[PDB]
Design an enzyme around this catalytic site. Structure first.
Site, mmCIF file in Angstrom:
data_model
loop_
_atom_site.group_PDB
_atom_site.id
_atom_site.type_symbol
_atom_site.label_atom_id
_atom_site.label_comp_id
_atom_site.label_asym_id
_atom_site.label_seq_id
_atom_site.Cartn_x
_atom_site.Cartn_y
_atom_site.Cartn_z
ATOM 1 N N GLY A 26 0.784 -1.232 0.000
ATOM 2 C CA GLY A 26 0.000 0.000 0.000
ATOM 3 C C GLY A 26 0.812 1.276 0.000
ATOM 4 O O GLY A 26 2.018 1.237 -0.192
ATOM 5 N N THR A 27 0.153 2.410 0.207
ATOM 6 C CA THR A 27 0.830 3.713 0.240
ATOM 7 C C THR A 27 1.873 3.796 1.350
ATOM 8 O O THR A 27 1.951 2.905 2.195
ATOM 9 C CB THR A 27 -0.167 4.857 0.484
ATOM 10 N N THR A 28 2.644 4.886 1.368
ATOM 11 C CA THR A 28 3.680 5.093 2.396
ATOM 12 C C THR A 28 3.275 6.163 3.419
ATOM 13 O O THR A 28 2.772 7.244 3.066
ATOM 14 C CB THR A 28 5.075 5.485 1.801
ATOM 15 N N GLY A 158 4.660 1.166 4.276
ATOM 16 C CA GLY A 158 4.063 1.322 2.966
ATOM 17 C C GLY A 158 5.168 1.351 1.920
ATOM 18 O O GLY A 158 6.323 1.614 2.249
#
Ligand SMILES: [Mg+2]
Ligand SMILES: [Mg+2]
Ligand SMILES: [Mg+2]
Ligand SMILES: [Mg+2]
Lengths: 240, 238, 222, 198, 241, 204, 247, 196
Positions: A26-28, A158
């Site tokens: 997923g995102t960071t 992430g």
């Protein structure tokens, strides 16, 4: 290797690894413990021009003094927050004094804990960063699917965690006395940009929040407005 | 596979459980004083981004009982909590503070129950409880995931068990008593670090380690600074 | 209902009469208000009889199960705490006041619990109807540090106080003693002041005075 | 209260039970049978609280008939009355007790002899030669103590009882509107319907 | 659809799960019960042997269920005790309610109904026992009943269960006059029983007995679970050293 | 508003040299109106005896409840219930229902088949145990009984005499109590044999 | 592989798991017990993991009641907790109903009742231990009992369970007569226990106790006639090795 | 019944009598009305015996359990714990209970949880059967914080007169000194206060 409760021939719970594997995907997200208070930032990914900006907030407050963010499975994150919300507010009603960050983590860790014990349930698919203040200073931790968490000087998960990691590494040594409340923000603003260079073909929207007795006044406020802009531009110059 | 008898009655999930306790990678040792008790555990902090305060495998269960655990941090904090509350509930329900040896019983008991009824997977941790109660003095009992405890005059948990062990054993066939002759804790502490350094073919700075001491009803964790000063102490005298 | 307890330099002693009333009537001329919780911890209890007994039975029962499991030994306050936690969980509905006393691997002990959950402590406690006579006796003849002989002599002479000036109590004296190192001796009827004098006439009837209409030889087993 | 009588004789039992029904002031029905045959040879008269009465009776009845076809064998007067007492025994310590008194008349076929059990709502049973619940006893019990003989014919019994009635009328404040009488014997149950013209 | 689970039905309406258990019986000690126009007999051969085992201040084959009823076990020791217990209780509720002795037919039935219960629900396995019920009630007099784990009960003139009860069975079919007074039966019992044994010969120790009888002199019923002695003796009477 | 006092009845027991005795009246009736004169308050479970006073249904219910349990005891233990044992039981039983108490006054008595020691006990409706060595009384005329017993009990009577004493004790106290009478019965318990006797009394 | 694993009937009639439980038994430590006309004796080996563990804090022969003690062979842990509940049931379901303590036979059965539960039920594995309970009571006299995880139990004169049973059960078989007094047994026990060892044979490395006679000392009180003392006697490290003299 | 707690420069100290009366009779004229929940946190019980006693036990438990995970707790953190217990059950409870505790940082705090459950941080509070006559003294003779020994007198004389006019409250006096130093166990025998 297929069920959640079970152990491998040499003591290993695979479902949790995959849990971890999805958290990375997923995102960071990041966070930084500074002078007094903390600073968080996440990576909202604008997939189209049909997304209202300043809108879908990924960061959430707890009580009125705890910043909080994560990444991996978004609904899992949201869910976990609710539990943390009760626990907080129940405690508060009971002991009167707003909840100590140190224990808070456990309340959560203990809950994330459980979802590694029974097979009928699914492991928590998110790594979570958070912090806040109290009497004995500000703190910041980071909880993973395994339930194991700790206190960091700054955290990251992430997609691109290393970018911000080695990035967080530097800050330590040049400012081994805690970075300025203000500079903390604008610095975070940069550390994100740098770590985004994977979703590079796809534009994005950066979100930031923070805590501080001097800046926020004990509270957790959303970094939005004027300080928010310059903090970007600040990143925009070093972005070369 | 799963929690119900093998063909030779040995349901491995319990066996497997063990490796994982070990798997963490830290060494825990413990020995008795004469009016105190001590446990050694290593404090390996890799990630230069964490905070050593937040790290530890030893916690203050009670006013006098401490606990060390060679095992995975998530599962430990659990055991930590339950135990921590069983004693809290005890003093209340019975009028007197709960001793070492006992907690380790309901503790082992607990892990047995789980195991047999199947209400959850066993935690992959070995708990090593310490203190000194005015009925049996310097007490040391250990518990494993296969729900089971017993007593040690001095013990160890880790990837390298028997090494730390054998030393003490040899040091015991000679000292001939079943504990450490000495009045001051500082002095005993010194002794164990000593018997561990020698036992690893390794040296430790003032942060590479983790130790606790159980006194005459006032258990306390050894902190970063005081910790170093014992290395001062045991440098020339060696 | 009239009892007391007094600890000396190396232990403690509790005593109670042997009469149980029932409004104005005397039900048992010889009853033991002294019950055993455990070898070293004993109780004396007044108020509602069936309550006081069954309750100790209960507690004694559990405390045994405890010591066994713990492999240690019965602490006095363990018994006290057990009693008053349950005792009050039933807000008063279980009339039983009592002087709990014994010795544990840490000292001699003596307490008094009321029927509601109240617990007290001192060197000497009296519970029962004649709690006032036996109190007044102890409140003039008491001095710190008394001996196995001094204390005993007193306790039994306090009970005697109630036996005479108070109606709701009488007959003989029951005593029990716990010494900080030694055993415990149950002395059923250490005294016997009240004894019926020999009757005037012999009332045995001459065989065949009672008229019978029928008779047989009832059955028992298979 | 109402009127409930019963008398055991030679090779039978007889049950009397007033007919009127009252609601405070007016009298509704006055030709009401306070009876309920449990089985071919068992029978039960009753008097009690307005609702409590008729419900309980039928309920008891239900169980019995049930048992009687299940087994195909009939249940003994003795045992029956035992069960009824059981139920009431519980009833009395229930959140709400069925306030009801009863008389149970049956002919025990194995012994070839008639049994009669009186039972109050508290769950108090007793095998008797004759009985009556409530105030009913006061007025009559004497006459029975007087003239009763175990050997009396079925007819003898009726006369007796008839006399007890004439008395109940003469000294009782209430108007019970007469009585319905019934006989349990080796042949089963039949009603002395004639006690209107008699 | 094959073996596993009781809730399963094979393509031909068979409940294997049951059929195994209903057969598991063929492993237990040979128990026999016989009817006479004056008394009922329960004979049984012990199992689990060695040389270091008592059996006097105990038993495990003949259990007295009611002062008027008795049963001969042949199955899982663990199982039996459970049913035996609730069978005793219920029988007493009957007494406490009707104030009368519980009829054999009825009792057998309720039990057969519990065994049957376990024959139809998931999460539980059927009991692996078989019983020879022997008793009397004034409703239908003397009665010999039997039941398997399938939850079926049966009225028998004289029956056997357990080991070799096909062999042991037929021996019975021969000698049996309906009136056949008790002693001829007690006798017959052994005759039938001896013939079906892996022991070099029939020794008292490894054997259990009991009888039921009633009359005019008793006016009521009396039953006797035979003690170690009486047996060692009657054995001799039937001509055995 | 007292229940115990509704039905009537009394029971008394005494210990003789090597034996015991227990008797009760026969009357049963709702307050004023006398109903039965064949109602017995004494039964037994093998060799153990129980006399119960107080509220009628509760009496009956108890007998049943005890017959039940003793049968179940003797069965699993292959031996009849012992006196001392029974006492401790009927005691606990009374208590299990301590907040919906049974309105009765039991009295146990018998002869232990091992020691051979005579036994007697009495209890309040909740199970408080009154161990006595002379006599036990329960029921309506409790007070009148203590008046008799206190004069007449003589330590260790011969069975033939004890009968005469207890008979007269019961018999006479019963006449000054308006709610007890209409016949009585006394049992005499010896090691082996036991003799039941009904006596003649005023029927008013 | 088979129709084993799970709680259900194998084609013949053999109940699955159960047998594998009776496997953790046969594999476990060696233990015995002898009923002997005026006493009864139970014992088991105390094979120490290592000499660093003060084994002196773990009973194998444990006290069930002041007239009954028992012992095991198999899964250590199963025996530890099994005992505590076992003790309570001897209370809640007996002493609190009767005022006294239960006879051998019944307490055993009561323990068996619990041993049972673990079986008839999916979701729960039975106990991996067989118990040797020895006791006494005023009416049945001296008793000896074995209890398997299958719930079932038997009355013995003497026997063994565990590794060295095939053997021991034979040695004991030879050495038994109905007139032996306790000390005879005690002696005889050791000599059987003798062979069945691999480690040592001193005091602290042998767990044994016995049901003998009243110990008016052990009570702690005095003044009550009928209350005289426990019969259960756990011989301590000392009393033992001394009896090693007459072999 | 007669209790209270007063704050000053080194912290706070609470004191009370020993007299406990069942009717017009003295059950135990030597009561330890001052009770410890935590090391630097104590309280003085008012009103009902059995109730107050049990409340404490529970609280003592909560706290002694709090610490084992959330470090050492405040004085306010403790009051709220009584707030819950007192409130929830206002119907089966009779408790005047005064709480007091010290922490180096916020000095010593005084909170009163009277009947009903209402909580209060005051300079000092006073409850118990005989508090009724020291509304005159106390308030009037009260200087803002004093000295260790200087304060010991407020306690001494407030408590003295309360015995002088209220029989339901008497016996000996007992004080508990809570300071930076630690706990100090006081006791002032009769012939003393009477003289004043
Ligand atoms: Mg699971
Ligand atoms: Mg009375
Ligand atoms: Mg009269
Ligand atoms: Mg005063």
């Amino acid at each position: 290797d297929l069920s959640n409760s079970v152990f491998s021939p040499d003591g290993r719970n695979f479902q949790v690894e995959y849990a971890v594997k999805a958290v990375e995907n997923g995102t960071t997200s990041i966070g930084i413990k500074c002078n007094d208070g903390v600073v968080f930032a996440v990576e909202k990914l604008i997939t189209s021009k049909l997304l209202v900006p300043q809108k879908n907030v990924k960061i959430q407050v707890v009580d009125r003094h705890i910043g909080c963010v994560y990444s991996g499975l978004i609904p899992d994150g949201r869910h976990l927050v609710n539990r943390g919300r009760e626990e907080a507010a129940s405690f508060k009603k009971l002991y009167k004094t707003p909840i100590p960050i140190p224990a808070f983590a456990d309340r959560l860790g203990q809950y994330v804990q459980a979802h590694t014990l029974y097979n009928s349930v699914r492991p928590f698919g998110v790594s979570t960063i958070f912090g806040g203040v109290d009497k004995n200073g500000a703190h910041l931790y980071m909880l993973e699917p395994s339930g194991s968490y700790w206190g960091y000087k700054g955290a990251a998960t992430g997609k691109g965690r290393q970018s911000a990691k080695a990035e967080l590494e530097k800050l330590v040594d040049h400012h081994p006395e805690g970075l300025s409340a203000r500079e903390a923000v604008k610095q975070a603003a940069k550390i994100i940009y740098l770590a985004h260079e994977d979703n590079k073909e796809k534009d994005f929207e950066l979100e930031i929040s923070w805590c501080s007795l001097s800046e926020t006044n004990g509270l957790h406020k959303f970094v939005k407005g004027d300080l928010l802009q310059e903090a970007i531009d600040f990143a925009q110059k070093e972005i070369n | 596979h799963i929690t119900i008898f093998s063909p030779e009655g040995r349901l491995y999930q319990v066996e497997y459980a063990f490796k994982a306790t070990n798997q963490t990678n830290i060494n825990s040792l413990a020995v008795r004083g004469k009016d105190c008790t001590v446990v050694i555990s290593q404090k390996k902090v890799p990630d230069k981004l964490l905070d050593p305060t937040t790290v530890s495998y030893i916690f203050c269960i009670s006013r006098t009982i401490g606990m060390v655990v060679n095992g995975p941090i998530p599962d430990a904090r659990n055991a930590a909590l339950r135990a921590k509350a069983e004693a809290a509930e005890f003093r209340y329900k019975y009028g007197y503070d709960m001793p070492c040896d006992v907690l380790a019983k309901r503790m082992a008991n607990l892990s047995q129950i789980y195991t047999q009824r199947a209400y959850m997977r066993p935690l992959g941790v070995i708990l090593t409880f310490v203190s000194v109660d005015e009925e049996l003095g310097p007490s040391i009992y250990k518990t494993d995931p296969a729900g089971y405890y017993v007593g040690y005059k001095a013990t160890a948990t880790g990837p390298k068990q028997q090494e730390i062990t054998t030393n003490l054993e040899n040091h015991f066939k000679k000292s001939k008593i079943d504990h450490i002759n000495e009045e001051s804790w500082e002095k005993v502490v010194e002794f164990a670090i000593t018997h561990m350094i020698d036992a690893l073919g390794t040296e430790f700075s003032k942060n590479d380690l983790e130790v606790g001491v159980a006194t005459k009803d006032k258990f306390f964790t050894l902190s970063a600074e005081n910790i170093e000063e014992r290395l001062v102490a045991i440098a020339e005298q060696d | 209902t009239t009892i007391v307890g007094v600890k000396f330099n190396n232990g403690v002693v509790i005593a109670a009469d042997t009469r149980s009333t029932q409004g104005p009537i005397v039900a048992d001329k010889n009853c033991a208000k002294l019950h055993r919780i455990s070898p070293k911890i004993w109780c004396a209890g007044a108020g509602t009889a069936a309550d006081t007994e069954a309750v100790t039975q209960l507690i004694g029962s559990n405390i045994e199960l405890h010591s066994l499991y713990t492999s240690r030994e019965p602490r006095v306050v363990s018994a006290l705490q057990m009693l008053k936690q349950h005792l009050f969980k039933y807000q008063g509905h279980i009339g039983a006041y009592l002087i709990v006393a014994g010795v544990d691997p840490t000292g001699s002990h003596l307490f008094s619990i009321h029927a509601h959950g109240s617990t007290d402590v001192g060197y000497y406690l009296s519970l029962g109807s004649g709690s006032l006579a036996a109190m007044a006796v102890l409140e003039s003849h008491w001095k710190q540090d008394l001996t196995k002989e001094e204390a005993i002599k007193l306790a039994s002479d306090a009970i005697q106080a109630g036996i005479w000036n108070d109606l709701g109590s009488g007959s003989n004296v029951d005593v029990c003693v716990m010494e900080i190192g030694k055993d415990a001796e149950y002395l059923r009827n250490y005294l016997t002041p009240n004894v019926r004098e020999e009757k005037q006439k012999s009332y045995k009837f001459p065989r065949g005075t009672t008229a019978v209409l029928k008779e047989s030889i009832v059955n028992i087993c298979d | 209260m109402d009127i409930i009588l019963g008398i055991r004789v030679q090779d039978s039992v007889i049950l009397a039970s007033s007919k009127a029904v009252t609601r405070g002031i007016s009298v509704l029905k006055d030709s009401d049978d306070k009876t309920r045959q449990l089985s071919p040879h068992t029978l039960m008269s009753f008097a009690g609280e307005a609702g409590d009465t008729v419900q309980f009776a039928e309920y008891i009845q239900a169980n019995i008939q049930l048992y009687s076809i299940r087994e195909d064998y009939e249940l003994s007067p003795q045992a029956v009355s035992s069960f009824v007492r059981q139920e009431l025994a519980k009833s009395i310590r229930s959140r709400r007790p069925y306030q009801v008194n009863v008389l149970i008349g049956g002919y025990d076929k194995k012994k070839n002899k008639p049994e009669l059990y009186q039972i109050d709502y508290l769950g108090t049973k007793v095998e008797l030669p004759y009985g009556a619940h409530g105030y009913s006893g006061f007025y009559t019990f004497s006459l029975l103590d007087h003239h009763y003989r175990p050997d009396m014919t079925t007819e003898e019994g009726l006369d007796l009882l008839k006399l007890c009635v004439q008395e109940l009328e003469k000294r009782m404040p209430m108007d019970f509107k007469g009585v319905i009488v019934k006989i349990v014997d080796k042949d089963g149950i039949r009603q002395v319907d004639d006690f209107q013209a008699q | 659809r094959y073996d596993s689970r009781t809730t399963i039905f094979s393509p031909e309406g068979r409940l294997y799960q049951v059929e195994y258990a209903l057969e598991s019986i063929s492993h237990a000690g040979t128990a026999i019960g016989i009817m006479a126009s004056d008394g009922i007999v329960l004979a049984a051969e012990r199992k689990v042997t060695s040389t270091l085992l008592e059996q006097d201040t105990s038993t495990e084959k003949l259990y007295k269920l009611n002062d008027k009823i008795a049963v001969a076990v042949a199955g899982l020791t663990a199982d039996a005790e459970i049913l035996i217990n609730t069978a005793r209780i219920h029988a007493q509720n009957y007494l406490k309610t009707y104030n009368e002795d519980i009829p054999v037919e009825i009792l057998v039935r309720r039990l057969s109904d519990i065994k049957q219960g376990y024959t139809q629900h998931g999460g539980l396995r059927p009991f692996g026992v078989s019983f020879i019920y022997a008793g009397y009630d004034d409703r239908y007099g003397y009665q010999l009943y039997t039941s398997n784990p399938s939850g079926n009960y049966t009225g028998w003139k004289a029956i056997s269960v357990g080991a070799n009860t096909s062999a042991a069975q037929t021996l019975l079919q021969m000698d049996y006059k309906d009136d056949m007074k008790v002693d001829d039966a007690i006798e017959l019992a052994l005759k039938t029983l001896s013939k079906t044994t892996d022991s070099s010969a029939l020794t008292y120790d490894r054997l259990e007995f009991a009888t039921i009888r009633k009359g005019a002199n008793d006016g009521e019923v009396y039953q006797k679970i035979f003690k170690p002695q009486e047996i060692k003796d009657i054995l001799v009477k039937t001509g055995i050293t | 508003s007292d229940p115990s006092s509704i039905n009537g009845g009394i029971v008394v027991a005494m210990t003789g040299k090597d034996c015991v005795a227990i008797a009760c009246d026969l009357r049963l009736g709702s307050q004023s109106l006398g109903v039965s004169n064949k109602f017995e308050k004494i039964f037994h479970y093998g060799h153990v005896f129980l006399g119960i006073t107080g509220l009628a249904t509760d009496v009956t219910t108890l007998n049943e409840m005890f017959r039940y349990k003793t049968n179940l005891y003797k069965l699993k233990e292959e031996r009849a219930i012992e006196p001392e044992t029974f006492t401790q039981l009927v005691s606990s039983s009374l208590y299990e229902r301590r907040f919906g108490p049974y309105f009765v006054g039991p009295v146990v008595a018998g002869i232990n088949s091992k020691s051979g020691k005579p036994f007697i006990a009495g209890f309040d409706l909740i199970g408080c145990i009154d161990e006595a060595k002379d006599f036990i009384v329960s029921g309506t005329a409790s007070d009148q009984l203590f008046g008799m017993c206190e004069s007449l009990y003589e330590p260790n009577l011969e069975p033939e005499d004890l009968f005469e004493t207890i008979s007269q004790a019961l018999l006479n106290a019963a006449d000054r109590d308006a709610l007890s009478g209409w016949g009585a019965v006394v049992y005499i318990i010896k090691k082996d044999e036991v003799v039941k006797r009904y006596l003649k009394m005023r029927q008013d | 592989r088979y129709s084993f694993s799970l709680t259900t009937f194998s084609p013949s009639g053999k109940l699955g798991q159960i047998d594998y439980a009776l496997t953790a038994v046969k594999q476990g430590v060696t233990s015995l017990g002898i009923k002997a006309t005026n006493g009864v004796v139970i014992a088991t080996e105390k094979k120490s993991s290592s000499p660093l563990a003060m084994s002196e804090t773990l009973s194998k022969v444990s006290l069930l009641t002041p007239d009954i003690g028992a012992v095991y062979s198999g899964m250590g842990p199963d025996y530890r907790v099994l005992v505590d509940k076992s003790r309570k049931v001897a209370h809640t379901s007996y002493k609190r109903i009767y005022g006294e303590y239960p006879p051998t036979k019944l307490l055993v059965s009561e323990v068996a009742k619990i041993m049972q539960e673990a079986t008839q039920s999916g979701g729960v594995r039975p106990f991996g231990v067989s118990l040797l309970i020895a006791g006494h009571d005023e009416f049945n006299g001296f008793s000896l009992y074995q209890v398997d995880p299958s719930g079932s139990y038997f009355p013995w004169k003497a026997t063994a369970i565990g590794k060295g049973s095939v053997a021991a059960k034979t040695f004991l078989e030879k050495r038994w007569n109905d007139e032996l007094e306790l000390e005879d047994a005690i002696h005889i026990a050791l000599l059987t226990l003798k062979e069945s060892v691999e480690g040592e044979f001193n005091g602290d490395t042998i767990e044994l106790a016995i049901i003998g006679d009243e110990n008016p000392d052990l009570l702690g009180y005095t003044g009550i006639p009928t209350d005289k003392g426990p019969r259960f006697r756990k011989l301590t490290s000392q009393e033992i090795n001394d009896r090693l003299e007459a072999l | 019944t007669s209790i209270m707690a007063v704050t000053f420069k080194d912290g706070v100290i609470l004191g009370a009598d020993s007299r406990t009366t069942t009717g017009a009779y003295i059950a135990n004229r030597v009561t330890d009305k001052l009770t410890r929940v935590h090391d630097k946190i104590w309280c003085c019980r008012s009103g009902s015996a059995a109730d107050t006693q049990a409340i404490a036990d529970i609280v003592q438990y909560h706290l002694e359990l709090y610490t084992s995970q959330y470090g050492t707790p405040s004085t306010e953190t403790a009051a709220s714990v009584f707030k819950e217990l007192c409130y929830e059950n206002k119907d089966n409870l009779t408790a005047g209970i005064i709480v007091a505790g010290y922490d180096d940082k916020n000095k010593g705090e005084v909170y009163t949880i009277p009947l009903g459950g209402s909580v209060h941080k005051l300079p000092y509070a006073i409850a118990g059967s005989g508090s009724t006559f020291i509304y005159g003294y106390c308030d009037k003779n009260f200087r803002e914080n004093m000295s260790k020994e200087e304060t010991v007198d407020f306690i001494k004389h407030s408590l003295s007169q309360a015995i002088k006019w209220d029989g339901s409250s008497g016996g000996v006096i007992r004080m508990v000194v809570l300071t930076a130093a630690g706990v100090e166990r006081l006791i002032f025998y009769p012939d003393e206060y009477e003289q004043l």
